[PDB]
DNA sequence: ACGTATGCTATAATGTGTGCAGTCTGACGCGG
DNA sequence: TCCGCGTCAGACTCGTAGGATTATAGCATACGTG
């Protein structure tokens, strides 16, 4: 595929493929010439080197290095280990309806509450604004609703405020050690780019207000809203599963 | 052992997703094994109901 | 004391007078690169070395050859100013003179046949600034000094390769600067092996055979000898009394007359002196004793001529009797010992399957080139090429130096190649260590870790350019015609240029300078790393490397290193630390002569530190004499204990040499845990400079040193009176004494005005001097972005109070007043720089006009006709900075769009839209715009308006240069003319253009008038070509990337203020997020009324153990108490005498204050300008370890009429009622870290998608969703929440059906699960099929 | 270390007392970064089998 | 023993004929007349000559083993067409072939984007002209400075330099820190997110409701012209093929359908609202 | 005609090598 | 059957930043489609 800068970019497979096809076609040419066997031998050794380098480069011998003196990424490599498809592009995923930001204290909040910035929840609940807008008849279409949101007009804040009520949000902190590494709350819109978290559940995350960031996630489906309120709500999660002991505790 | 008990489950998808992925697949290919899915890793991969 | 110091003096609580003044902190970077360009005449260094090393190059035949003559650096094509802006390397032309000499073939060597000689260019080398930076493609970049294992020899031992045996196997290894590796290693059976390049393992006698050594010579070299004489019938043996030591008498040991030891008895030290004093030489022995002993030299039968027994063969009874009757009654056996002189080479030869020299060169050749049939020359050439050719091998100076002093040698300086002696000497010391004497070196000792700065590395990379040219020269010389071919036709300039830019770009050490703070610049140039090429790796890195080593003392800082996996490897250099001439580090030390602590200093190497005993700086001197105390706490041999006076040989110079720059700025570091001290010094580097530079009330003294040496300020080259002050520039008139007699003598300093940083922050230089002020040489004239009267100003100090507040300071969370936000004191400036590129697509060229399709008149209001926003125009996210349009091709207007473009109309032109618009969210003021155009397509009208200014501004700027330079030049002539022909007004009648017409008598001053007259003309002619260079480079079409036609760079200026989410900290690692900006109504306040600025949590202190912050607070309060008293007297408008008494009483308080500043010396006017700067608070210096103690702080608090405690009676602002008990209040110098929330917070619903994985992208940079990793997944599995997970596997990520379908369902209100199956798995199916594996989805 | 730290945070360490404090400080923080991988890797190992 | 494909082949050539002047002629004379064994020998013999040549043609496109294989093909074409009757040596004639076949095969399999010989051939002269200039100008030559010495077009020089611009692989780590490659950044061009997918779906369903709100003869003529309901996007004059068979009345009725529809967008709440879009 | 490809040059030349060489505990698999 | 030396499998989890190569000759008829 071509870059924005008029450059192109290719995967290392294409390069490894050209090594296989060239040598294979050169063998067809040498079998046409009935060349001496000593040469045919080299061609067959080469062909195998290229095929083995295509399946799993760094294995049989030296992995065929390319332009930046680094080894060409082969097929097996994209199925192999952390950097493979499994662990990196399948079991772990970047996810929509997700935002992260510096967290700060919320000593006014109750246990089932958490501060969520307005401009964060704005972008997060974008399809829920367009939906409640067509209902009231303020938007006739969705690109109309898109511009209503963009202009950040006054009456759009009140609609956003409407959908968010009685709607849980998931708050995650890295690293996710135990299940309590995510808990659900009822978002409270606050003017400011900081998330405000409940002091008592800080223990579960191990979340220190010294520059911590927490990922937000919006449960879309009604089942996810029920799951978040039933299982993942902060009030329904008190005691640790490890020990029958309260992890929710002042400090 | 843990490392071995993970690679022992009939699910080869669960085994390759773990480690030794080069070996798991080759042993599973030669055996011609078919995984009928029971574990979580197996259904989270395919993006189905856990 | 100086003028700029007279304006504001810092009270110093030091009691250890500085015998050594802090050096220039940017010593390494500048001195290193200076060596590289330095054309040394003989002592080759840098380029001169690179040429003499490779050159002269001669053809493969050897009839023609190229010889290096001399090289030179031309002045830069584009200077720093220009280079930073255009975007190309700040480099200098390399012109090297080459000489092509050709010989006669059948004739001997007709050297004089055609000595062609010419000058040739090859590559342009990035120069270094005066800041120690390299401008690469318009980026000031820094190359970090490397730390690597020193070449020479090194003895190690894996304390248990096979824990099976658990035997400590000892090994040696010869490390060259260039060449192959040479290792020697033992094995479970103590057989010496050699592994060149750590390849195959070969017996260690095979390399000796290759050096022409017979079995006999080998043995004769390592082992001693045991003589056996067969006299008449009794077998006899020579005994050195010191041999049968710690062994057992296997036989009855009896001499000329006495039986000493009995059979089966241990021979003690008594029995050894018994024999040694009796002077025993010969002993009669049994023949059963030799059975086991190894014969040394060969023994041929004198009679027959055959070998009775070869060298190195275990003797027996029958072999000995065969030798006695052959006619040898003088056999010499080897001295085999299992306790001391060990038999290793002996047992090794029994494994060694080689024979002679020529056969030893075979297995050496069969190791490195296996499969090629060996010849006499191929085997010899290889081995001779390895460690014995001037080409392949080079230990270097350091290599041979360390190699020699490792073998306790005779020479410091010797040969670059390994000699036979060297090899065997190395095998010998390996065997010494194996025996018992000799200690292995450790790699963690800095005596083995050498430092390699940029200049040496630039030299190395410059060699590969020459090596890659060597190839093209030789091949073209031999086959090419001799005469016709010129030397530059055979040279190529690209392989050198490419190999050097490879270093100045791709290398791990060449990285973008982190310049978001003067401290960041100076500590990042003083960074030293072990990583990148020829070093270590996080994957390879151990622990003992990282660990602080007692060699670091005075050389490297124990508390300066990232807390990330690159923790122990990266390290800043110590304050007074410097590089050894060879490579190692060295630290200053006060020599003690005959007890007397002499002021003479000696920089002791890492090696010689261990030798002498070194007293600590805590030790007390007797005011010119010796240590006051008899016992002195000192340290040596890497340990610490008390010693007597005469035993002390050296002493630590200052008390700050242990630490780095980063750590020398932390006050009361002595009262801080190293864990929090490290984080504190690490965050002090991240301190974004504020709007108004506020000086630190609680400093160390190092403040000024940093600000000045960083090269961010503008300091005076020559002292005198500031003829002119300006925001843009400074003009200073030089005094007669300093001013040169030739030139005029008026220095010019055009101060760098507001422009961008590498971290997108403000860079300004404001004048810190008044119009017409007398300034001394080396005084700070303009302050930098984070400096104040020359002293460093990283963050701001403020009244702080430690106490909880309704949990708004929960876990280190910060509660800051609105009053801080009102003063806009914590308002950092972010100078963003956008760019608009006109490219050449396949469809056609792009241009830059105001004509943009689908736009409001509102968007094109701030633009001009050319299509560029006005200078000074406020902009916001959505507004367009620069109008751009690209070609629109075969575009399928969908039926619904063809109808919509036909209804409302606006048939958009066949030119696409891609105008550069302010990024959604940013808003500031355009301060300037720069236009770069290829030399070609005609220009925008705004690009012409900007050319108008550059030109007419340069014409004015140069007019001003020649004008004030004229005035300063005639100012001299006017003074010269009075000396001789004294006439005042009559001379000043006619204009000044007819002054060179007037002269003087035959005198030195007549020659002076001629100098100034023809130098005035020299400037008059110089002014034209100075104008030419400016005019052309403005008319010049700046060369751009292929495809690009022209570019427009825009400069914005946003003013972000502090808000919840912003991260701030002290310098004691006390971190924290601002949680709430409390109303001024709600802020606590003292009985007197003034409120607190920040309210910190007291619990972020015991756990942390960083009590330095509390001392910072207490002193800051005392310091302010004094400023509050001075502020009151200056408001009351009292008196000069009253201020003098109080301020003199303030400066003199400490026990033995280092600075003794008398104010009787200060004039009345000088006192009031001082007091006026002291009113904000008397700035105090607390040296790192020689800082102030409670006795001094509490005494200062009594001067300020502050409480001894430091706790004040506080009242809650919300209420008005007092808090139940006192709280610590004072001024803590806190900082505003770069981690601001506006650059942190992010949100996404639906946006871009990945290319193959088809899941969303990553980061706010690309607008990507947060990653939900497998750990995040298992959490939902644990809860049981199955849809919440499946929702985050499919619709929120890949599932292409799901994501769009779900979107439509949410806007419908029906939040319904609609899965399908992520793409990333459908990829995995085909990926396994592409690997030749049948993976199909078997159905129900 | 055979020689511990004698001083406290109030009294102030001398130059070495701090040099000695470093040895323990860096190694304690080295095992915060590097040793965590063994314990975090255990979490991974345990999970797969369970 | 030996398990490197390089050293194995390099071994087998090391045990193959090294021919003299009259020997080359003896085999070559029979090789042209087809002796079979003869053509095999001269080839087997001069594999050693191919390796010495590919020792200076490395590090340019393919590996040393890839240069030998294509260098062997040059020796074979040299054997197909050598003149033994001529007194001139073979080693001389074969070198011209082995140098050509290598250069040519590197020109194709070096660049990912197959650059034909013609655009490449020219590019080299532009680059080798840059050498001469660079040494005497001591300044890397511009697109103009190269155009001034050849007296050739500016865009030609520039477009030929554009094709020289090399590639960065998608799988390449980023800033000496393999945290993420370019694939984990570079966006997908084809598929725009749900927002853009539902835009067209919602906008085009709104039109289905607007076409049923207009007249039957107005939504017939308007739809089938733009190709909304019909099969082919016709013009004012081409709508006559169906039933309209008019030029004036088709244009009045097209615009009459659009005027009533513009008031349907002003009342629903678009018009100027959906004009910016 | 235009773009791409195919071809030949006749001194003699005939065996390669280039480049990082402090990971580490734990576990088998081929010879010896 | 057992013991030394080789390959091979892991090594926590999330955030942010930024941009550059050498050269394939040189010229004349062969092969593919408006
Ligand atoms: Mg934290
Ligand atoms: Mg913390």
Curated annotation (Swiss-Prot), chain A:
Transmembrane segments: none annotated. Co-administration of salinamide and rifampicin or salinamide and myxopyronin suppresses the emergence of resistance to both antibiotics. Acetylated on several lysine residues in the presence of glucose. Mg(2+) binds at residues 208, 210, 212. It comes from the Bacteria. The RNAP catalytic core consists of 2 alpha, 1 beta, 1 beta' and 1 omega subunit. When a sigma factor is associated with the core the holoenzyme is formed, which can initiate transcription. The rRNA transcription and antitermination complex (rrnTAC) consists of RNAP, NusA, NusB, NusE (rpsJ), NusG, SubB, ribosomal protein S4, DNA and precursor rRNA; S4 is more flexible than other subunits. Belongs to the RNA polymerase beta' chain family. DNA-dependent RNA polymerase (RNAP) catalyzes the transcription of DNA into RNA using the four ribonucleoside triphosphates as substrates. This is DNA-directed RNA polymerase subunit beta'. It comes from Escherichia coli (strain K12). The lineage of its organism: Bacteria, Pseudomonadati, Pseudomonadota, Gammaproteobacteria, Enterobacterales. The chain holds residues 253 to 503 of 1407 of the full protein.
UniProtKB/Swiss-Prot annotation, chain C:
It catalyses: RNA(n) + a ribonucleoside 5'-triphosphate = RNA(n+1) + diphosphate. InterPro entries: DNA-dir_RNA_pol_bsu_ext_1_sf, DNA-dir_RNA_pol_bsu_external_1, DNA-dir_RNA_pol_su2, DNA-dir_RNAP_su2_dom, DNA-dir_RNAP_su2_hyb_sf, RNA_pol_bsu_bac, RNA_pol_bsu_CS, RNA_pol_bsu_protrusion. GO terms for biological process: DNA-templated transcription. Its EC number is 2.7.7.6. The gene is rpoB. The modification N6-acetyllysine is found at residues 1020, 1198. This is DNA-directed RNA polymerase subunit beta. The RNAP catalytic core consists of 2 alpha, 1 beta, 1 beta' and 1 omega subunit. When a sigma factor is associated with the core the holoenzyme is formed, which can initiate transcription. The keyword DNA-binding does not apply. Belongs to the RNA polymerase beta chain family. It holds the Pfam family RNA_pol_Rpb2_3. Gene3D superfamilies: 2.40.50.100, 2.40.50.150, 3.90.1100.10, 6.10.140.1670, DNA-directed RNA polymerase, beta subunit, external 1 domain, DNA-directed RNA polymerase, subunit 2, domain 6, RNA polymerase alpha subunit dimerisation domain, RNA polymerase Rpb2, domain 2. Keywords: Acetylation, DNA-directed RNA polymerase, Nucleotidyltransferase, Transcription, Transferase. HAMAP family: RNApol_bact_RpoB. NCBIfam families: PRK00405.1, rpoB. DNA-dependent RNA polymerase catalyzes the transcription of DNA into RNA using the four ribonucleoside triphosphates as substrates. It comes from the Bacteria. The keyword Transferase applies. GO terms for molecular function: DNA binding; DNA-directed RNA polymerase activity; ribonucleoside binding. One of its GO terms (cellular component) is DNA-directed RNA polymerase complex.
Curated annotation (Swiss-Prot), chain E:
Residues 122-197 are annotated as: Sigma-70 factor domain-3. The keyword Disulfide bond does not apply. Residues 236-255 bind DNA. Keywords: Cytoplasm, DNA-binding, Sigma factor, Stress response, Transcription, Transcription regulation. Residues 4-37 are annotated as: Sigma-70 factor domain-1. Induction: Subject to complex regulation at multiple levels (transcription, translation, regulation of activity and degradation). Transcription is induced during entry into stationary phase and in response to different stresses. Transcription is repressed by antitoxin MqsA. mRNA stability is regulated by small RNA regulators and various proteins such as Hfq, CsdA, CspC and CspE. Finally, the cellular level of RpoS is regulated by proteolysis via RssB and the ClpXP protease. It comes from the Bacteria. Residues 210-263 are annotated as: Sigma-70 factor domain-4. The keyword DNA-binding applies. GO terms for biological process: DNA-templated transcription initiation; negative regulation of DNA-templated transcription; regulation of DNA-templated transcription initiation; response to stress. A motif (Interaction with polymerase core subunit RpoC) lies at residues 66-69. Changing residue 122 to T: 2-fold increase in RpoS half-life. Does not affect interaction with RssB. GO terms for cellular component: cytoplasm; cytosolic DNA-directed RNA polymerase complex; sigma factor antagonist complex. Changing residue 125 to K: 3-fold increase in RpoS half-life. Changing residue 121 to E: Eliminates RpoS proteolysis. Lack of interaction with RssB. It is found in: Cytoplasm. Disruption phenotype: Stationary phase cells lose resistance to killing by endoribonuclease MazF. One of its GO terms (molecular function) is sigma factor activity. Residues 42-112 are annotated as: Sigma-70 factor domain-2. Signal peptide: none annotated. The sigma-70 factor domain-2 mediates sequence-specific interaction with the -10 element in promoter DNA, and plays an important role in melting the double-stranded DNA and the formation of the transcription bubble. The sigma-70 factor domain-2 mediates interaction with the RNA polymerase subunits RpoB and RpoC. The sigma-70 factor domain-4 contains a helix-turn-helix (H-T-H) motif that mediates interaction with the -35 element in promoter DNA. The domain also mediates interaction with the RNA polymerase subunit RpoA. The gene is rpoS.
């Amino acid at each position: 595929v071509p870059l924005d800068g008029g450059r192109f970019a290719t995967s290392d497979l294409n390069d490894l493929y050209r090594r296989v096809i060239n040598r294979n076609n050169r063998l067809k040419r040498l079998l046409d010439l009935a060349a001496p066997d000593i040469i045919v031998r080299n061609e067959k050794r080469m062909l195998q080197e290229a095929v083995d380098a295509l399946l799993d480069n760094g294995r049989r011998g030296r992995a065929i290095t390319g332009s930046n003196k680094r080894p060409l990424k082969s097929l097996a490599d994209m199925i192999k280990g952390k950097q493979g498809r499994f662990r990196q592009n399948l079991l772990g995923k970047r996810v929509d309806y997700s935002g992260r930001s510096v967290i700060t204290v919320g000593p006014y909040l109750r246990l089932h509450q958490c501060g969520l910035p307005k401009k964060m929840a704005l972008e997060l609940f974008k399809p829920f604004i367009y939906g409640k807008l067509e209902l009231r008849g303020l938007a006739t279409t969705i690109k109309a609703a898109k511009k209503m949101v963009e202009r950040e007009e006054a009456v759009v804040w009140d609609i956003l405020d409407e959908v968010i009520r009685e709607h849980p949000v998931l708050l995650n902190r890295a690293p996710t050690l135990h299940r309590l590494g995510i808990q659900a709350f009822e978002p409270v819109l606050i003017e400011g780019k900081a998330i405000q978290l409940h002091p008592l559940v800080c223990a579960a995350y191990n979340a220190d207000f010294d520059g911590d960031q927490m990922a937000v996630h919006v449960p879309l489906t009604l089942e996810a809203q029920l799951e978040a309120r039933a299982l993942m709500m902060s009030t329904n999660n008190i005691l640790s599963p490890a020990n029958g002991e309260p992890i929710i505790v002042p400090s | 052992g843990i490392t071995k008990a993970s690679l022992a489950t009939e699910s080869f998808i669960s085994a390759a997703s773990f480690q030794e992925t080069t070996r798991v697949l080759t042993e599973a290919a030669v055996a011609g094994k078919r995984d009928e899915l029971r574990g979580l890793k197996e259904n989270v991969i395919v993006g189905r109901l856990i | 004391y100086s003028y700029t110091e007279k304006k504001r003096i810092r009270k110093d609580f030091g009691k250890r007078p500085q015998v050594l003044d802090v050096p220039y902190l940017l010593s390494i970077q500048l001195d290193s690169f200076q060596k590289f360009i330095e054309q040394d005449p003989e002592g080759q260094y840098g380029l001169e070395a690179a040429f003499r090393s490779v050159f002269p190059i001669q053809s493969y035949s050897g009839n023609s050859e190229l010889q290096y003559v001399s090289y030179r650096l031309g002045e830069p094509v584009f200077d720093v100013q220009e280079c930073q802006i255009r975007g190309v390397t700040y480099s200098a032309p390399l012109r090297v003179k080459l000489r092509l000499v050709i010989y006669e073939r059948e004739a001997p060597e007709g050297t004089v046949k055609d000595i062609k000689e010419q000058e040739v260019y090859m590559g342009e080398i990035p120069l270094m600034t005066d800041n120690g930076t390299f401008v690469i493609n318009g980026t000031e970049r820094v190359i970090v000094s490397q730390l690597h294992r020193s070449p020479g020899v090194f003895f190690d031992s894996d304390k248990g390769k096979t824990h099976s045996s658990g035997k400590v196997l000892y090994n040696a290894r010869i490390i060259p600067y260039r060449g192959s590796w040479l290792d020697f290693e033992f094995d479970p059976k103590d057989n010496l092996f050699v592994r060149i390049d750590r390849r195959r393992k070969l017996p260690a006698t095979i390399i000796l055979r290759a050096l022409n050594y017979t079995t006999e010579q080998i043995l004769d070299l390592f082992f001693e000898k045991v003589i056996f004489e067969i006299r008449d019938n009794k077998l006899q043996m020579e005994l050195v009394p010191e041999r049968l030591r710690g062994e057992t008498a296997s036989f009855d040991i009896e001499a000329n007359g006495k039986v000493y030891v009995e059979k089966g008895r241990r021979i003690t030290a008594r029995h050894i002196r018994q024999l040694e004093k009796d002077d025993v030489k010969l002993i009669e022995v049994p023949v059963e004793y030799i059975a086991g002993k190894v014969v040394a030299k060969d023994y041929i039968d004198e009679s027959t001529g055959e070998l009775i027994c070869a060298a190195n063969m275990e003797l027996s009874l029958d072999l000995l009797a065969k030798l006695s009757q052959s006619g040898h009654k003088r056999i010499e056996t080897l001295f085999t010992n299992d306790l001391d002189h060990g038999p290793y080479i002996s047992e090794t030869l029994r494994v060694d399957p080689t024979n002679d020299r020529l056969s030893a060169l075979v297995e050496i050749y069969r190791m490195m080139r296996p499969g090629e049939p060996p010849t006499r020359e191929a085997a010899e050439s290889l081995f001779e090429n390895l460690f014995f050719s001037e080409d392949r091998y080079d230990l270097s100076a350091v290599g041979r130096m360390k190699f020699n002093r490792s073998l306790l040698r005779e020479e410091i300086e010797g040969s670059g190649i390994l000699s036979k002696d060297d090899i065997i000497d190395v095998m010998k010391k390996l065997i010494d260590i194996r025996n018992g004497k000799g200690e292995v070196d450790d790699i963690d000792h800095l005596g083995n870790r050498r430092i390699r700065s940029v200049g040496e590395m630039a030299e190395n990379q410059f060699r590969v350019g020459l090596v890659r040219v060597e190839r093209a020269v030789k091949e073209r010389l031999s086959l090419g015609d001799l005469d016709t071919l010129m030397p530059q036709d055979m040279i190529n300039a690209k392989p050198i240029s490419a190999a050097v830019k490879e270093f100045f770009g791709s290398s791990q050490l060449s990285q973008f300078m982190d310049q978001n703070n003067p401290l960041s610049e100076i500590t990042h140039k003083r960074r030293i790393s072990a990583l990148g090429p020829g070093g270590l790796t996080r994957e390879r890195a151990g622990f003992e490397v990282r660990d602080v080593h007692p060699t670091h003392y005075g050389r490297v800082c124990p508390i300066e290193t990232p807390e990330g996996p690159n923790i122990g490897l990266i390290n800043s250099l110590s304050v007074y630390a410097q590089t050894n001439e060879y490579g190692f580090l060295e630290t200053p030390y006060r020599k003690v002569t005959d007890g007397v602590v002499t002021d003479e200093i000696h920089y002791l190497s890492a090696i010689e530190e261990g030798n002498y005993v070194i007293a600590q700086a805590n030790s007390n001197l007797d005011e010119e004499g010796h240590f006051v105390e008899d016992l002195v706490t000192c340290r040596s041999k890497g340990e610490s204990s008390l010693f007597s006076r005469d035993q002390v040989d050296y002493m630590d110079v200052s008390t700050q040499q242990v630490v780095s720059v980063g750590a020398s700025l932390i006050p009361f570091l002595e009262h801080d845990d190293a864990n929090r001290a490290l984080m504190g010094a690490n965050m002090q580097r991240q301190a974004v400079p504020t709007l108004r530079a506020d000086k630190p009330l609680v400093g160390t003294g190092m403040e000024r040193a940093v600000a000045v040496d960083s090269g961010v300020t503008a300091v005076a080259k020559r002292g005198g009176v500031v003829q002119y002050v300006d925001a843009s520039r400074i003009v200073i008139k030089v005094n007669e004494d300093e001013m040169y007699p030739g030139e005029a003598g008026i220095d010019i300093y055009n101060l760098t005005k507001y422009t961008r940083s590498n971290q997108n922050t403000c860079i300004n230089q404001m004048p810190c001097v008044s119009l017409g002020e007398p300034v001394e040489r080396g005084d700070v004239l303009a302050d930098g972005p984070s400096t104040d009267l020359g002293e460093l100003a990283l963050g701001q100090n403020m009244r702080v109070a430690f106490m909880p507040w309704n949990g708004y300071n929960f876990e280190d969370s910060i509660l800051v007043s609105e009053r801080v936000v009102q003063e806009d004191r914590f308002t950092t400036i972010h100078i963003q720089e956008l760019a608009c590129v006109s490219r050449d697509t396949k469809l056609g060229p792009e241009e830059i006009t105001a004509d943009i399709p689908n736009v409001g008149e509102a968007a094109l209001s701030k633009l001009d006709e050319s299509g560029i926003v006005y200078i000074g125009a406020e902009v916001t996210g959505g507004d367009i900075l620069v109008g751009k349009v690209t070609p629109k091709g075969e575009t399928q207007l969908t039926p619904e769009e063809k109808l919509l473009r036909a209804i409302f109309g606006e048939k958009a032109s066949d030119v696409k839209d891609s105008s550069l618009r302010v990024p959604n969210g940013v808003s500031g003021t355009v301060i300037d715009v720069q236009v770069f155009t290829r030399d070609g397509v005609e220009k925008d009208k705004r690009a012409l308006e900007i050319e108008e200014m550059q030109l007419k501004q340069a014409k004015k700027d140069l007019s001003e240069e020649l004008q004030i330079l004229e005035a300063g030049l005639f100012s001299r002539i006017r003074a010269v003319l009075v000396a001789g022909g004294v006439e005042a007004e009559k001379l000043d009648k006619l204009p000044r253009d007819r002054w060179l017409e007037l002269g003087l008598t035959d005198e030195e001053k007549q020659n002076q008038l001629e100098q100034l007259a023809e130098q005035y003309d020299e400037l008059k002619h110089e002014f034209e070509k100075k104008l030419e260079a400016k005019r052309r480079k403005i008319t010049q079409g700046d060369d751009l990337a292929p495809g690009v036609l022209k570019i427009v760079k825009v400069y914005l200026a946003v003013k972000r203020r502090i808000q919840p989410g912003d991260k701030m900290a002290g310098r004691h690692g006390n971190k924290g997020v601002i949680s709430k900006i409390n109303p001024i109504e709600d802020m606590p306040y003292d009985e007197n009324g003034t409120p607190v600025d920040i309210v910190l949590n007291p619990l972020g202190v015991p756990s942390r153990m960083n009590i330095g912050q509390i001392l910072e607070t207490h002193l800051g309060m005392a310091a302010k108490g004094i400023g509050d008293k001075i502020n009151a007297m200056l408001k009351q408008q009292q008196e000069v005498a009253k201020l003098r008494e109080f301020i003199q009483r303030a400066y003199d308080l400490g026990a033995d204050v280092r600075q003794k500043v008398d104010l009787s010396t200060f004039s009345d006017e000088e006192v009031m300008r001082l007091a006026e700067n002291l009113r904000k608070g008397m700035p105090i210096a607390t040296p790192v370890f020689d800082g102030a103690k409670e006795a001094e702080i509490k005494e200062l608090l009594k001067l300020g009429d502050l409480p001894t405690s430091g706790q004040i009676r506080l009242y809650d602002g919300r209420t008005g009622e007092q808090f139940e008990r006192p709280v610590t209040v004072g001024y803590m110098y806190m900082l505003k870290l770069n981690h601001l929330v506006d650059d942190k917070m992010h949100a996404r619903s639906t946006g871009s998608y990945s290319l193959v994985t088809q899941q969303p992208l990553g980061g706010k940079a690309q607008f990507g969703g947060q990653r939900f990793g497998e750990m995040e997944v298992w959490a939902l599995e644990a809860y049981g929440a199955a849809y919440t997970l499946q929702e985050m596997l499919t619709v929120k990520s890949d599932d292409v059906n799901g994501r769009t379908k779900m979107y439509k369902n949410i806007v419908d209100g029906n939040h319904q699960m609609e899965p399908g199956m992520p793409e990333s798995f459908n990829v995995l199916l085909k990926e396994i099929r592409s690997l030749g594996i049948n993976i199909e989805l078997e159905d129900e | 270390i055979e020689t511990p730290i004698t001083a406290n945070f109030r009294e102030g360490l001398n130059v070495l007392q701090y040099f000695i404090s470093t040895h323990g400080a860096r190694k304690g923080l080295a095992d915060t970064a590097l040793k965590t991988a063994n314990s975090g890797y255990l979490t991974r190992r345990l999970v797969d089998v369970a | 023993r030996v398990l490197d494909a390089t050293q194995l082949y390099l071994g087998e050539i090391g045990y193959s004929p090294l021919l003299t002047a009259e020997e080359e002629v003896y085999f070559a004379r029979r090789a042209l007349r087809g002796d079979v064994a003869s053509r095999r020998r001269m080839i087997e013999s001069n594999l050693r000559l191919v390796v010495k040549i590919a020792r200076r043609y490395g590090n340019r496109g393919l590996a040393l083993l890839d240069l030998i294989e294509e260098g062997n093909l040059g020796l074979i074409r040299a054997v197909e067409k050598f003149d033994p009757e001529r007194g001139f040596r073979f080693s001389t004639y074969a070198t011209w072939w082995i140098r050509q076949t290598i250069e040519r095969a590197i020109m194709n399999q070096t660049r990912t984007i197959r650059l034909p010989i013609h655009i490449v051939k020219e590019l080299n002269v532009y680059l080798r002209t840059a050498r001469e200039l660079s040494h005497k100008l001591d300044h890397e030559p511009s697109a103009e400075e190269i155009a001034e010495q050849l007296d050739k077009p500016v865009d030609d020089v520039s477009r030929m330099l554009r094709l020289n611009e090399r590639i960065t692989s998608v799988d390449t780590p980023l800033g000496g820190d393999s945290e993420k490659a370019l694939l984990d950044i570079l966006a997908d061009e084809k598929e725009n997110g749900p927002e853009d997918t539902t835009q067209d779906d919602d906008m085009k369903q709104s039109i289905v409701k607007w076409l049923f709100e207009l007249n039957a003869k107005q939504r017939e003529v308007l739809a089938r012209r733009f190709g909304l309901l019909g099969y082919e996007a016709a013009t004012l004059e081409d709508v006559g093929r169906e039933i309209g068979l008019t030029r004036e009345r088709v244009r009045q009725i097209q615009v009459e359908g659009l005027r009533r529809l513009r008031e349907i967008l002003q009342t629903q709440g678009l018009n100027i609202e959906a004009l910016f879009l």
